[PDB]
Symmetry: D2
Subunit: 499 residues, 4 copies
Amino acid sequence: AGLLEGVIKEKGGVPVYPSYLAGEWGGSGQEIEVKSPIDLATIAKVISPSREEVERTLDVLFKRGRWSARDMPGTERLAVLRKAADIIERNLDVFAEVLVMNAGKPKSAAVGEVKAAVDRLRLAELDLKKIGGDYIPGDWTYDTLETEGLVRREPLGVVAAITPFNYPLFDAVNKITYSFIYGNAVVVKPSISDPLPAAMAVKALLDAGFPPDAIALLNLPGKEAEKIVADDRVAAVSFTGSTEVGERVVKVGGVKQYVMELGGGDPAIVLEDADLDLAADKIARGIYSYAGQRCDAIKLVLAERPVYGKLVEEVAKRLSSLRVGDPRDPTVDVGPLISPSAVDEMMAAIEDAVEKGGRVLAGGRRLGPTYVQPTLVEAPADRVKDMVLYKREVFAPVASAVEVKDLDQAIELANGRPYGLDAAVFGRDVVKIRRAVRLLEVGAIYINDMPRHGIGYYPFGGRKKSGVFREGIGYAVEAVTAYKTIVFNYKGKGVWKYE
Amino acid sequence: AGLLEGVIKEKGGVPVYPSYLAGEWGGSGQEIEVKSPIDLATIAKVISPSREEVERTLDVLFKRGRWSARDMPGTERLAVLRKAADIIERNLDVFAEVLVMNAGKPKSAAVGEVKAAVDRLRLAELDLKKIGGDYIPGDWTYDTLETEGLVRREPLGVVAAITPFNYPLFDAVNKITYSFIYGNAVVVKPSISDPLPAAMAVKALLDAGFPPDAIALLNLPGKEAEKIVADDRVAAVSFTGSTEVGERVVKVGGVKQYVMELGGGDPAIVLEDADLDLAADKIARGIYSYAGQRCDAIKLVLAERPVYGKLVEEVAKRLSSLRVGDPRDPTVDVGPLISPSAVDEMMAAIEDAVEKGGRVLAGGRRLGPTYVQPTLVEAPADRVKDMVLYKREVFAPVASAVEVKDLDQAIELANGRPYGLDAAVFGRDVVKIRRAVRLLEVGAIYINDMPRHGIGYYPFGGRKKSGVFREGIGYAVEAVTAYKTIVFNYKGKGVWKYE
Amino acid sequence: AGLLEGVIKEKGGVPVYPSYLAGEWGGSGQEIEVKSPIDLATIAKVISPSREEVERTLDVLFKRGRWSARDMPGTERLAVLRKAADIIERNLDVFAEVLVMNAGKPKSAAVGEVKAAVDRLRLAELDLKKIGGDYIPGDWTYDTLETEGLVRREPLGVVAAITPFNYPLFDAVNKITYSFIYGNAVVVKPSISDPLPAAMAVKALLDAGFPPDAIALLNLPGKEAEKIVADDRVAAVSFTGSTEVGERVVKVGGVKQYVMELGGGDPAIVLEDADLDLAADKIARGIYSYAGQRCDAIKLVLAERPVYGKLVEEVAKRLSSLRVGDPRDPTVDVGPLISPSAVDEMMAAIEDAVEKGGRVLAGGRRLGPTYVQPTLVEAPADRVKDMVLYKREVFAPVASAVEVKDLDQAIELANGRPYGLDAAVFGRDVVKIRRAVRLLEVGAIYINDMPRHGIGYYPFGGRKKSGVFREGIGYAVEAVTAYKTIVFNYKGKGVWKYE
Amino acid sequence: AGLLEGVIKEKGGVPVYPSYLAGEWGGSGQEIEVKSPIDLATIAKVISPSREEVERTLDVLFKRGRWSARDMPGTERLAVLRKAADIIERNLDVFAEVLVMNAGKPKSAAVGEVKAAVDRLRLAELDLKKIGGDYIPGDWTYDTLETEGLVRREPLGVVAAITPFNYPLFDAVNKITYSFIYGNAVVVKPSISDPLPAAMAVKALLDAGFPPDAIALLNLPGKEAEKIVADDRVAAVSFTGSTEVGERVVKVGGVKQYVMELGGGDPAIVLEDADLDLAADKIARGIYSYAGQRCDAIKLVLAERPVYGKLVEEVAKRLSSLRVGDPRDPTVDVGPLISPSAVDEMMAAIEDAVEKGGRVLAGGRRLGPTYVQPTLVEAPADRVKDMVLYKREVFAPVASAVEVKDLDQAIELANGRPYGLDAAVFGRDVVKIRRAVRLLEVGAIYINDMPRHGIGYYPFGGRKKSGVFREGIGYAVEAVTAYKTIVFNYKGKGVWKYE
Ligand SMILES: NC(=O)c1ccc[n+]([C@@H]2O[C@H](COP(=O)([O-])OP(=O)(O)OC[C@H]3O[C@@H](n4cnc5c(N)ncnc54)[C@H](OP(=O)(O)O)[C@@H]3O)[C@@H](O)[C@H]2O)c1
Ligand code: NA
Ligand code: NA
Ligand code: NA
Ligand code: NA
């Protein structure tokens, strides 16, 4: 609605959302149904581009787009991003509604994501703490005397932004922002599961002045996107999703610049030192927020003997007092999961933990094809490692709780999972905290708080199976930019006497 | 000889070089013959590790090596690198000899590479202009108030260094240096074509104090290395080689941090402004140095109408006055190519240019299975683009020469190849130079000089098919290092009043 | 008018502007007449604070102000600066009028300064490319093992901003912006000659949300300001003015952080290579803009034999075709000088040049107590050095022109003055330009353009008698900020194994 | 002895040390007696230069020196500094002896300073993490489109290094190192009290290859140095000394770049959280090291109620168990103070504290004209602020001890002195530590350790009366370097399309 006034096709009673082919909205490939996880009902259809349209779109992005983006003064690109922020802001409710409608996101969360997208856009000003270059004098080596170097960052060209389902609006806006602020053209490929928010963001950007040939939004389902990734006109692939799909993306893409935010869960460690009120509060939230459909969601709780009982007790009470229902009730805390399949896996996973010695301390009851109570499962250290909930990321509101002897055991268990995205540590002793910070093999550690990538004010990314590289204001530049070195030779000319 | 005193096996009359399995020299896989391109005679054999030894080596590097490298104080790692420099230096002649023996490198060039390796090691001090981290205050956003960020760079763990044949000693030393200075363990995989220099460097490093379990040298032929690349204990792959093999490496490795120096040739542009003496001199060298077996070798010469004649004339004279023979004669300018196959391709390539309108202006005569004269082939702009010498990188001493109307045509042709490593521009006008610098799509541009990565005093790397990321003192850190973000939450505590 | 609605006192027919005493507008010291250089008529009066009010103001700034500025989140300080930009923008005409009224600035120039002030405020976002800190690992020295360093920049406290007459609005806004963006409180001391624009800027800032106790505007005449400079509650003095007054400021202030932009003229060099059209245009402007009352004004023109004639010819024609009159005529090019005294000095200076062999090539005629034609005086290299116009900065629209043999003589003469603010070089040859850049002893060199500090997009400042330190977006932080180092000792604790 | 073989004049039985006049050792001004604080006996004489020799020396440094230093390739300057390190190292004992002889420094301390000087020299490699420059694109503002900026750091020219008495060798070496590594010429002015170590360092540097006209060592007593400071050929003054002399230096020098390390004492805070063993140990040392003749010496101890008793108890025991005597006994802990006057002030200061309610807890007994026991004086919070030991820096081994209610009172008292050099905080709670770090107004805070500038691995400097700017590896560059901005204008040329 609204922004997509003349774009959306009212056909067969259901709104039809077209792909944006770097110049004109359209598409003539298969139409795909977009369902809401709230009622499993079709809320719209998206037109996927045909193979020829994908080909033509990439051709336009490559031959015209990257130059349109690059030739637009940085000061103007920023203006575009700021105007788009204004547009999204005044259309907040419609944007939030779609997030609730399409992603099953609780009203307040949906509003939070729209605001995050808006802030991210406005902070593009801070993404400049990085586009400056370096000057290198040549007199620190005899071979380089009477020589000089200039190292500048330049945009790579066409960046493919591949987005997961859990933060459809923000991720698209985020990847588009850091790719565009530096002069790249962008091909957005949203999850076919919830591509509507991206269509709205893209539209807002186009209305804001975004070079019409420098951006594309292709509604291609999963494997159909490989055509974009494998193409040589795509210099970089910014991907946020599962470890398995990310692996496939790299293998399909080959040599190319990548940003792989592959998530997985995050462990939380509570030292005997911690404020248990703060810890229980933040840990409970980290477990249930958006029905645990957050890569930075808490999946494992580790607490030392002296505080384990009280901590898990408080977290259990907070979880069980949560209202699960229609994300439309500003009263509901937890909406549905993206699909019934996601819930199936969570139940099977809980069964696995229980079979292996685990005990549910809160939740555990499925409430419908796509509804479940955020669950907390207790587990003995000697058996937790073999449980699916530990070895894998069950994208749902569920976490293991484990009592530990000391910090070293906490760290050991925390590092025992195959992932390494973030980790949380609640405590007050600087030495123990410093040790945890040193030994936790993750991209980010949150001291006295739940893991929260937020809008990327602080850089984040993975270690181990959680991926490579970082996103964040100012740090994402590394993935969508390339250095250009210019060496000047003045040997023999009379510039320098001896140096 | 020398350093490898008790390591090399004198068996069957031929010296047998063993792999270094992160702790002990050995191996029990197939023995492979190492031949000299000077006479095509076997000069040694290398023992490739068996599958179980590769497995065990990776296990050691992962479980012990990365910690030994990381736990060694940076100041000590530097001491090791400096001691190794001392050792290689006093063993210069033996190192140079092997480069001449095994790589067919002219005496002076071999000496140059040993010195480059020595300097690179000693400059590890300058690789520190990057291991420092960032402090991020949280008051530039309301959501981050009473919060702070600390971003540190940490080593990734186990880096796989894969080296090409053309600079066996330097590349190994270089990749080991920047991987180790930051705390990584390293698995070196040299070209089976000339693995001897690496064995000597590794030995020198081990004698210098390099953690014995933090380094490995595996003599595995081509595809046998995929076992190292595909392994999850290898967090990064530093690869220098052909575009095609690099592509295979990424597809085999999957998600991982990469540095892909994929070479290709470099075009040289001469403006009517240029000092033609300097230009002819540098361009001639760029074409023939090490029989053109340099990724930064000149493969295409573009000169404006008014200077084309004189320029190509002078370059032709310099090339034809070159002495081709045994790299052992301090009198020889050009030794043999690495293999007769390499020469076959160069002759076929020349034939192609001639068939398509090209004309040899110098050289063109094969002198033996692995010897050829550095060749310069003239070609009309209207036909050069379809010639193999243009569309491809013929790793040999051969370059196309093309007359152009103006800078724009020079740039067009320069950018018309599928590669984008470096480019050279000879001229004096700041505006034309600035324009060339803006439009040349390459990782590095050399003003008034031949392209020379040298020891990486200035960062270099590719665009387009020449790869991704950069090597260079201080810049290589990006590929073998990862950020670790630590966010401290002080909300509610009495640290800050309002900010 | 406007913003100062309830502030300005309508007394005795003339508007009376009060000082802002960090909380309330007022003052009870001597009232001082403010005259326009357009007609020498009193246009207003300013109330200077009494000694007790200065004392009380400093006390407030120190005891409350620096905390109010520091405790306001950076994100809020930026909001204040942006709101103030909005206010000044919608009040553009009134701001421009006062600049014309009070400074005798040509209409378009006045509009340019208001816009510059507005842009400077809005770019405060880019002043953040510097408030981030550094993290220093301790393992690069054995003595520092198991130790770490955190280096943050903090505001100094109370910064005294002392402004000259030539850019009353911008300078005040500029110094306030970079002092405040980082958390400092500010005491503005404008030239008693034209303090009105500052009063308006300060008012706009206060209306924008600027902490009322964190800013002060004291209308103190010259030496009366020493009371502010000498006070220990003033941690930094940002001063832009004459070399002689700056010297006095430091001697009165003692140990303290300083930014001394002491101006002086700038020499312009034209190589036989230069586009003479561009050169004549830019040089003419550099000589006359704002009746040469610009620290970055061109005061000496040096051109090589082959272009000297044409260059000076064209510059002379441009100068003589200038309309001198009331800055109110959008038709006038040059308004009056700030005072008749300034004109007296310019005439005496011209007389000196003529007596010493100089010859007027354009202008030279005084048109009134405060009006004169922008003048160009030719002079032989062998005598120019002893002329007052060379040895000194005659703040007026006048410049010496001198023919030179080659670049070396140009540089010699350019460096022969006691100043070293900027220098301009018109030419195209990279080698000659690089040499000029190396040998010109100045803070900034402009290639193919007149010197233009502008809003400080690029940092600028002096060498030799032109002062110390730099202003500019991102660079001014050094003068109003201080480092705070935090060293953490973990020796003996179990954080690190060996490193 | 040794290095000064042919330099020192054996006249009248006492060794006569000449000034180094930037080219030749000599001098013809008054000869001055240099006494040892060990026995008050003359151990040598130094020749101060005459006014004409000072004039000539400055002329040489300015006209030749700054170019010799600047024209020497950075790589060579580093070689010089490293060679000098080698020379000082092999002459360690002689250097240490002079420190013991001339400064009354305990044997181990003297050895520590020689080693510090040696390390500082060798770490000059790390002073390079700063001489690189910045490249600034012009498309972030419309006015700067088609424009670019290059900002390089250049040496200022002649730096005057003024050294205090307490670390004669290190300070001279340190200031010379960071001034020279960047290309400056240096005039060293050591304390006439102990100028011998500087003469030896300078000699070692000259033997190492230091440009003979780029360095000078003038033995001028106190006020006689103003001639160097006030001279316009001296672009920067690096001064370490008393607040009062520093003030005089700035007032004599006028506009110039300064580094003012003005010391004062440091307060130490111990939270109920602290390891009291570590705290007592470090605090005791901080109080007595080099008889408290350290700017980073502990002068005030603040401990919370619950640990005050035990802490002060342990510190008292450590102090009273100290052996005071001839610094030559590797058995002595504390040698003499620099002069009997220094001891007089310490006794008077103790008397003052006692008269105002203070009580000596350890030491307090004078042992000779220049010997005293390191003293610890207890004082009630309600009276400590008026005691001389609090309000002033009594350069001697003496500190006040004060019990406090909580962190806020500790901070209040810590900030109540007029100085702000460093501060120490022993404790473990991250929140309390973070708060202390925020509120302590000092240049450096040491967590769980005594303040130790060391060789400047971490930057340090003052706040309030302790001075301005910082010294430290990599940070000292700001004081002896200046930016040079080069702006290139390409407006109208065909470099850029629109951006
Ligand atoms: N971009 C740069 O900075 C740069 C610098 C120097 C050279 N180069 C390029 O490198 C080439 C010269 O070296 P080269 O001819 O020896 O090229 P190459 O064949 O591409 O070198 C490949 C390296 O990878 C190993 N390898 C081969 N197949 C592999 C596989 N399937 N999996 C894992 N590793 C494998 C090779 O070992 P084996 O030798 O045992 O097969 C060799 O050590 C040229 O194309 C040149 O342009 C680029
Ligand atoms: Na590919
Ligand atoms: Na993989
Ligand atoms: Na003062
Ligand atoms: Na002065």
